[PDB]
């Protein structure tokens, strides 16, 4: 979720991302562990061979027939973890992730308690406004010299400057609000 | 409160084991007690008649002709 | 040997899509470009939503 | 939280070992087998048989039955 | 209990010390899997997967094509579950 | 079905056999079915 | 006792095969798996125009330098392009083996396309295309390919539409060159008085570093074509003779019943009447190319069709034996000459991935009998929709119902 999506996918990342779906869809078929760990080091073998094929055409012909072998030999109910897509606990504790710009409309009574909390909050909001200028300028001075732009954003590159467009990767509602 | 354990068999409290064996043992005492006192799980207690041993007199089967 | 058969529903997955596997240089050029449109639009949402000193409603004119 | 010495885990003595030996027959080394050892290593080492669960507590249950039957 | 970093740190270190290919007496955080531990890219898929099964969550593909220092794994895991 | 083409349509001889045999039975079915209809349409009026 | 064809593989991927014989006039040749099937209708004449230009100018040998070298040792330089393969071959002496290989290296890489040269060729190619129409059988076979493989890259032609030929950019060419000239899709084949170890050394020195990596992973891929039964009837009544080709779908390179189909062709009125088994990858066209006066095309078609059905229904052992003997004399060998043997290797390494020896061909010929010949002929000829291409006075050429229907004997 953190890093940005690459435009096109390489050959490798397509092969190496099957090694994951495949092995992980082999642990739904092999419910036990010793059977699995066995039937899987046999999987690597399949990927281990045909590793050094230099003939791209061939390589993309082993890959295209691997992902069809896989599609027809996949488990309907695989083991997808909780907190991962589709499976449970994915958006469970999102009802309790309020977006933090809401503590700004609190009644002076409510914010009266919880006093030091807002003393540190006002510091961070000073940090945010104190750098928007140096940030956006950075974002721009370092802008692409071509139309080729990826969603990757730059680091800080100077002391005191806060690595940019950061207010929402930091200050993110905590995962488990509980 | 208990302590998290890593790659080890979670330690168990006296009570956890005793209550578990308690509920299961009563299940078996009840199954055994009722089986002895009331074994009508098998046969009920009324035997099926063999419908094919009823003298033709019993059913009113007239003497053919 | 059943071949998956995309229907208007249950469409052809990303893998098992012949197009994706083989693509001309032009195609890559497209993709490498479409990201640009998105990256551009992304860096036009991300420094206007993360802008301090803003109260006005980000509009999302695409909606 | 302290953690058990990594060394403690070993594949012999567990079902992973037999998987290890047949994999070795093919020539594969079964690399992550050691990680999957604590499953079979100890405490959870004993095989669990289906009668054992269905019959859990039967021993005292019958002991209880006999006594009650007596009285 | 909640996951303190110095623990998560040890946990990721530990599992690797159980992977046969990775020497148990050298794996040192900051020892890049591939250019130091000299592990195949195919391996790194697995090393990550072990971690996904030690900590019970999925390191997404794009964010996991880069978990190569044996430490990135220790802050990424921690940053994910919000461990300060 | 590709069994048809291979068993019925492919060789003219086979193509024929199926036609003749089918026709032999079709008459039975058609007459029977048709009669059922005709009669019902006028069920009341017919000798019996 | 025929010497075996030994195949090696270089890191680049190019396969430097070879063969050896008492002869001393070797034919070295580079075969590339690149033709009009790999073109995408925006560069439909790129392989042909690179073929015309490849010889004319290379970076190391500027202008006509290469053609001089080739003259200095008295060697012969040839190149050809098909829908699937491209070949650059040299016939030379044995003792001139190194420099020839070096020359071939320039021709495949480090080649120079002079924009001027580009222009001069444009003229040559356009004009010839403008006069190529003269060759009827070429027109008829191009029409047959177009109407049989409609909508696919196998319909187009090696030459390509006039437009593409007019519009070509050093850069476009550069692309085709940099895209379809990869080292794993290349075979360095040698036949005659050559040593395999010397050729393998020469291969690395001059033919190493052949590109292998595509751009931005624009790794080409291929489409299994469709055989669309259809006809094309270019009527022009001023021509004195008519050329008609009728074909069905072929099996492909790797399907062994090709051999049996070849025997069927060896079993088979209107002037010329040649049978043919064009066999591209994953598809081919089995068939016939009969020329004929306008008043006999009709009969010929019937005769042709008749012969085929006879082969689907009433094949006897004597004609099968005759066809096997005729096929076993089409075997290519040192006596066929180097260039022919040379060519086979290149095609065998590109298509089959190996050089099939003549003993295996003889075994596959002698296993063919009459029953499996009529079975395979019924599989490929009986009740199939053909592709028809006619050019000339073709009014009495029957339309598609009479041809197709004639493909099934109401008596079997
Ligand atoms: C449980 C479901 C079962 C599904 C199993 C599946 O169908 C069978 C299968 O995966 S069949 C594997 C064959 N898959 C390949 O053969 C791709 C090879 N790809 C290369 O060799 C690359 O060209 C490269 C050199 C970059 C590799 O380098 P790298 O180390 O992967 O980065």
Swiss-Prot record, chain A:
Transmembrane segments: none
Entry keyword Cell cycle: no
Membrane topology, as annotated: Peripheral membrane protein
Alphabetical UniProt keywords: Acetylation, Electron transport, Membrane, Mitochondrion, Mitochondrion inner membrane, Phosphoprotein, Respiratory chain, Transport
Modified residues annotated as Phosphoserine in this record: 84
A Gene Ontology term for the protein's cellular component: respiratory chain complex I
Gene field: Ndufb9
Subunit structure: Mammalian complex I is composed of 45 different subunits.
Location in or out of the cell: Mitochondrion inner membrane
Function: Accessory subunit of the mitochondrial membrane respiratory chain NADH dehydrogenase (Complex I), that is believed to be not involved in catalysis. Complex I functions in the transfer of electrons from NADH to the respiratory chain. The immediate electron acceptor for the enzyme is believed to be ubiquinone.
PANTHER family, per database record: NADH DEHYDROGENASE [UBIQUINONE] 1 BETA SUBCOMPLEX SUBUNIT 9, NADH-UBIQUINONE OXIDOREDUCTASE B22 SUBUNIT
Species this chain originates from: Mus musculus
Domain of life (superkingdom): Eukaryota
Family: Belongs to the complex I LYR family.
Name by which UniProt lists this protein: NADH dehydrogenase [ubiquinone] 1 beta subcomplex subunit 9
Keyword RNA-binding: no
Chain positions with N-acetylalanine modification: 1
Single biological process term from Gene Ontology: mitochondrial electron transport, NADH to ubiquinone
Coiled coil: none
UniProtKB/Swiss-Prot annotation, chain C:
Keywords of the record: Acetylation, Electron transport, Membrane, Mitochondrion, Mitochondrion inner membrane, Phosphoprotein, Respiratory chain, Transmembrane, Transmembrane helix, Transport
UniProt entry tagged with the keyword Transferase: no
GO biological process: aerobic respiration; proton motive force-driven mitochondrial ATP synthesis
GO cellular component, one term: mitochondrion
Compartments where located: Mitochondrion inner membrane
Keyword flag Phosphoprotein: yes
Protein family membership: Belongs to the complex I NDUFB4 subunit family.
Protein task: Accessory subunit of the mitochondrial membrane respiratory chain NADH dehydrogenase (Complex I), that is believed not to be involved in catalysis. Complex I functions in the transfer of electrons from NADH to the respiratory chain. The immediate electron acceptor for the enzyme is believed to be ubiquinone.
The protein's name: NADH dehydrogenase [ubiquinone] 1 beta subcomplex subunit 4
Whole-protein coverage range: 3 to 65 of 129
Curated annotation (Swiss-Prot), chain E:
Name by which UniProt lists this protein: Acyl carrier protein, mitochondrial
Taxon lineage: Eukaryota, Metazoa, Chordata, Craniata, Vertebrata
Gene designation per UniProt: Ndufab1
Keyword terms: Acetylation, Electron transport, Fatty acid biosynthesis, Fatty acid metabolism, Lipid biosynthesis, Lipid metabolism, Mitochondrion, Phosphopantetheine, Phosphoprotein, Respiratory chain, Transit peptide, Transport
Taxonomic superkingdom: Eukaryota
GO biological process, one term: iron-sulfur cluster assembly
Residues of the full protein shown: 72 to 155 of 156
Complex and partners: Mammalian complex I is composed of 45 different subunits. Interacts with ETFRF1. Identified in a complex composed of MALSU1, MIEF1 upstream open reading frame protein and NDUFAB1; within the trimeric complex, MIEF1 upstream open reading frame protein functions as a bridging scaffold that interacts with MALSU1 on one side, and with NDUFAB1 on the other side. The complex interacts with the mitochondrial large ribosomal subunit. Interacts with alpha-1-microglobulin chain; this interaction is required for the maintenance of mitochondrial redox homeostasis.
Localization in the cell: Mitochondrion
Residues where N6-acetyllysine is found: 17
GO molecular function: mitochondrial large ribosomal subunit binding; structural molecule activity
Family membership: Belongs to the acyl carrier protein (ACP) family.
UniProtKB/Swiss-Prot annotation, chain G:
Biological function: Component of the ubiquinol-cytochrome c oxidoreductase, a multisubunit transmembrane complex that is part of the mitochondrial electron transport chain which drives oxidative phosphorylation.
Quaternary structure note: Component of the ubiquinol-cytochrome c oxidoreductase (cytochrome b-c1 complex, complex III, CIII), a multisubunit enzyme composed of 11 subunits. The complex is composed of 3 respiratory subunits cytochrome b, cytochrome c1 and Rieske protein UQCRFS1, 2 core protein subunits UQCRC1/QCR1 and UQCRC2/QCR2, and 6 low-molecular weight protein subunits UQCRH/QCR6, UQCRB/QCR7, UQCRQ/QCR8, UQCR10/QCR9, UQCR11/QCR10 and subunit 9, the cleavage product of Rieske protein UQCRFS1.
Keywords from the named record: Acetylation, Electron transport, Membrane, Mitochondrion, Mitochondrion inner membrane, Phosphoprotein, Respiratory chain, Transit peptide, Transport
Similarity-based family: Belongs to the peptidase M16 family. UQCRC1/QCR1 subfamily.
Source lineage: Eukaryota, Metazoa, Chordata, Craniata, Vertebrata
Membrane topology of this protein: Peripheral membrane protein
Organs and tissues of expression: Expressed in neurons and astrocytes of the cerebral cortex and hippocampus (at protein level).
GO terms classed as biological process: cellular respiration; mitochondrial electron transport, ubiquinol to cytochrome c; mitochondrial respiratory chain complex III assembly; response to activity; response to alkaloid
Residue(s) carrying N6-succinyllysine: 120
Sites bearing Phosphothreonine, chain numbering: 171
Gene name tied to this protein: Uqcrc1
Modification Phosphoserine occurs at: 169
């Amino acid at each position: 979720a953190f890093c940005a999506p690459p435009a096109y996918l390489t050959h490798q990342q397509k092969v190496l991302r099957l090694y994951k779906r495949a092995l992980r869809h082999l642990e739904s078929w092999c419910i036990h562990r010793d059977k699995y760990r066995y039937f899987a080091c046999l999987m690597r073998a399949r990927f281990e061979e045909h590793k050094n094929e230099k003939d791209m055409m061939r390589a993309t012909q082993l890959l295209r027939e691997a992902e069809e072998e896989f599609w027809q030999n996949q488990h309907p109910q695989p083991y997808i973890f909780p907190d991962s897509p589709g499976g449970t606990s994915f958006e469970r504790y999102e009802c309790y992730k309020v977006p933090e710009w809401c503590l700004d409309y609190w009644h002076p009574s409510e914010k009266a308690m919880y006093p030091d909390y807002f003393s540190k909050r006002e510091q961070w909001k000073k940090l945010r406004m104190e750098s928007w200028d140096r940030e956006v300028k950075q974002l721009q001075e370092e802008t692409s010299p071509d139309g080729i732009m990826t969603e990757a954003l730059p680091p800080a590159r100077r002391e005191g400057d806060l690595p940019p467009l950061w207010w929402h990767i930091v200050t993110r509602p905590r995962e488990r609000p509980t | 409160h208990i302590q998290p354990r890593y790659r080890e068999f979670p330690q168990l409290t006296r009570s956890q084991v005793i209550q578990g064996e308690f509920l299961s043992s009563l299940m078996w005492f009840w199954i055994l007690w009722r089986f002895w006192h009331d074994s009508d799980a098998v046969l009920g207690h009324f035997s099926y008649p063999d419908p094919s041993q009823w003298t033709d007199e019993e059913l009113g089967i007239p003497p053919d002709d | 040997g059943s071949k998956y058969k995309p229907a208007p529903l249950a469409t052809l997955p990303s893998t098992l899509d012949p197009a994706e596997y083989d693509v001309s240089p032009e195609t890559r050029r497209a993709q490498v470009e479409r990201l640009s449109i998105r990256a551009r639009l992304k860096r036009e949402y991300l420094l206007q939503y993360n802008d301090p000193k803003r109260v006005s409603h980000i509009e999302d004119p695409a909606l | 939280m302290e953690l058990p010495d990594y060394r403690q885990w070993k594949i012999e003595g567990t079902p992973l070992e037999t998987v290890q030996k047949k994999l070795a027959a093919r020539g594969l080394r079964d690399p992550w087998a050691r990680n999957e050892a604590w499953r079979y290593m100890g405490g959870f080492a004993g095989n669990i048989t289906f009668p054992s669960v269905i019959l859990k507590g039967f021993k005292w249950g019958f002991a209880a039955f006999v006594v009650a039957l007596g009285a | 209990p909640p996951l303190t970093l110095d623990g998560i740190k040890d946990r990721v270190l530990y599992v690797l010390k159980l992977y046969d290919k990775i020497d148990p007496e050298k794996l040192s955080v900051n020892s890049h899997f591939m250019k130091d531990l000299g592990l195949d890219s195919l391996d790194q898929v697995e090393i990550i997967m072990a971690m996904e099964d030690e900590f019970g969550f999925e390191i997404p593909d794009i964010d996991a094509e880069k978990l190569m220092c044996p430490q990135e794994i220790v802050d990424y895991i921690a940053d994910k579950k919000d461990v300060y | 079905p590709s069994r048809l083409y291979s068993l019925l349509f492919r060789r003219t001889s086979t193509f024929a056999l199926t036609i003749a045999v089918g026709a032999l039975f079709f008459e039975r079915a058609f007459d029977q079915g048709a009669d059922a209809i005709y009669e019902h349409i006028n069920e009341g009026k017919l000798w019996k | 006792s025929v010497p075996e064809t030994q195949v090696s593989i270089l890191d680049n991927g190019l396969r430097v095969a070879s063969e050896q014989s008492s002869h001393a006039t070797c034919t070295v040749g580079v075969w590339i798996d690149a033709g009009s099937r790999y073109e995408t209708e925006k560069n439909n004449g790129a392989g042909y125009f690179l073929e015309h230009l490849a010889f004319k100018g290379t970076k190391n040998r500027p202008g006509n330098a290469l053609e001089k070298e080739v003259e200095s040792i008295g060697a012969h330089l040839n190149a050809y392009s098909t829908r699937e393969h491209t070949a650059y071959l040299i016939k030379a002496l044995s003792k001139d083996l190194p420099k020839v290989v070096e020359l071939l290296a320039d021709i495949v890489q480090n080649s120079s396309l002079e924009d001027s040269q580009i222009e001069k060729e444009r003229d040559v190619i356009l004009r010839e295309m403008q006069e190529n129409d003269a060759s009827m059988q070429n027109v008829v076979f191009d029409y047959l390919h177009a109407t049989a493989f409609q909508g696919t890259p196998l319909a187009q032609a090696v030459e390509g539409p006039s437009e593409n030929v007019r519009r070509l950019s050093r850069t476009d060419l550069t692309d085709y060159l940099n895209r379809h000239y990869k080292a794993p899709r290349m075979v360095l084949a040698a036949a005659g008085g050559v040593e395999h170890q010397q050729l393998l050394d020469l291969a690395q020195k001059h033919l190493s570093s052949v590109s292998r990596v595509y751009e931005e992973d624009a790794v080409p891929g291929l489409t299994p074509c469709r055989f669309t039964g259809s006809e094309i009837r270019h009527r022009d009544d001023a021509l004195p003779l008519a050329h008609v080709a009728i074909a069905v779908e072929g099996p492909g390179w790797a399907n062994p019943d090709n051999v049996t189909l070849q025997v069927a062709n060896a079993i088979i009125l209107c002037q010329s009447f040649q049978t043919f088994n064009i066999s591209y990858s994953d598809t081919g066209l089995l068939g016939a190319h009969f020329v004929c006066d306008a008043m006999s095309i009709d009969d010929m078609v019937f005769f042709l069709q008749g012969q085929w059905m006879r082969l689907c229904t009433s094949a006897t052992e004597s004609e099968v034996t005759r066809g096997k003997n005729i096929l076993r004399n089409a075997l290519v060998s040192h006596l066929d000459g180097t260039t022919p043997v040379c060519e086979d290797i290149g095609r065998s390494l590109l298509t089959y991935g190996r050089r099939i020896p003549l003993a295996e061909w003889e075994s596959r010929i002698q296993e063919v009998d009459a029953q499996m010949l009529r079975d395979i002929c019924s599989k490929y000829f009986y009740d199939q929709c053909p592709a028809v291409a006619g050019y000339g006075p073709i009014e009495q050429l029957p339309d598609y119902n009479r041809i197709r229907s004639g493909m099934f004997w109401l008596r079997f």
